[PDB]
């Protein structure tokens, strides 16, 4: 399994952000709004292939979560689809980025702004978000935002769609990596 692939909780479907590790412990990052109130994660809609369990969740304010792998045999590729990821970096205005999600697949665009505040309502406000002109749709939450071999962010939310075009906000992945003391590979 790799970045952009579908992941299922008891509630719905999201996308795996990045496979990360700490020592010999493997986890995966995804959106906080997906990990919020979720315990177990599966690789299929049938819920027959277990992935692991939620180890951390930060939403709102931020939008990241981490899941500890309990499945010992499933391949945990340090890639996004077939794209190798070798490091993480900070987003910059004008940067060319690519997103992969379980619903829309791969779409590209650029970073148009930093430190954006997004109000999802009901007191669900996230801060310090990366704004881009990449589209995304339901099911794409938590999928990776990358640039070449560099991990940049996790899909948090947006408006519009891939047909008419849209705006998508991402949580900087650097902050998540530091919070959990994990690193991409």
């Amino acid at each position: 399994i790799s970045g952009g692939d579908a992941i299922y909780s008891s509630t719905g479907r999201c996308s795996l952000g990045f496979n990360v590790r700490s020592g010999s412990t493997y986890y995966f990052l995804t959106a906080g709004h997906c990990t919020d109130g979720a315990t177990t994660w599966w690789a299929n809609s049938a819920r027959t292939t277990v992935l692991g369990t939620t180890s951390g969740s930060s939403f709102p304010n931020n939008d990241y979560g981490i899941v500890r792998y309990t499945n010992t045999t499933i391949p945990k590729d340090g890639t996004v689809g077939g794209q190798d990821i070798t490091s993480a970096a900070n987003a910059t205005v004008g940067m060319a980025v690519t997103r992969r999600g379980s619903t829309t697949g791969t779409h590209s665009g650029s970073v148009t702004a930093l430190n954006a505040t997004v109000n999802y309502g009901g007191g669900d406000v996230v801060y310090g978000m990366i704004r881009t002109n990449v589209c995304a749709e339901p099911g794409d939450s938590g999928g990776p935002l990358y640039s070449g071999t560099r991990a940049i962010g996790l899909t948090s939310g947006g408006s519009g769609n891939c047909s008419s075009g849209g705006t998508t906000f991402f949580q900087p992945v650097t902050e998540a990596l530091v919070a959990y003391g994990v690193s991409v590979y």
Binding site: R13, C14, S102, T103, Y120, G121, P138, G139, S156
Partner: protein, 51 residues
């Protein structure tokens, strides 16, 4: 599903489908509710889950 607090400038995403009266499957409640607003209240919920 109540769309009173809509519209919203953005939605998270997660996939938890709803079926609208237009036979379109909406990815989640926020998407569905923004579409109801856009339809000026003509779109309604048919059932939960995909169409």
């Amino acid at each position: 599903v109540d769309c009173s607090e809509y519209p919203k400038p953005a939605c998270t995403x997660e996939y938890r489908p709803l079926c609208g009266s237009d036979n379109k499957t909406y990815g989640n409640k926020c998407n569905f509710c923004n579409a109801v607003v856009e339809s000026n209240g003509t779109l309604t919920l048919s059932h939960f889950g995909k169409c």
